[PDB]
Description:
Blueprint: E1 5-9, E2 18-26, E3 30-38, E4 49-52, H1 89-93, E5 101-107, E6 124-128, E7 134-142
Antiparallel strand pairs: 1-2, 1-7, 2-3, 3-5, 4-6, 6-7
Bound molecules: copper (I) ion.
Amino acid sequence: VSPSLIAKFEKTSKSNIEGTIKFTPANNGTVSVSVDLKGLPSDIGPFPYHVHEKPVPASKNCSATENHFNPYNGTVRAATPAAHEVGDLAGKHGNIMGESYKTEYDDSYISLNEKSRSYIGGLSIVIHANNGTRLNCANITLLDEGHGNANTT
Ligand SMILES: [Cu+]
């Protein structure tokens, strides 16, 4: 059982977007994704969001996360979920939209297993305006403090 992860979005002078995206292991080799966001600038949405390949640095420069996490050469536009990049959550499941957005879904492509080529731990998530401008971003970190088979959290 691989550990749960979370991306925590914080409000700054650059963006009012705040909230969380949680990743928890679920049944049948899937990962449950829970999105809970507010402060979105609705009129410039809907908002693509993706797992990107590099961490958000201390400067909070969303550009420094570089490209989408795409370990299998995926295409931006697809006729089936599997043709999307692994990190292309919005392409597969829908863009964030509105001023507030709360949703839950399963993704069977991302992995919580550090030994998987689809592992998303240590990466980042970027939320974009509809035109591609990066609005806010967050590192993907551990959801729980305490781990191991003899521990509690
Ligand atoms: Cu992105």
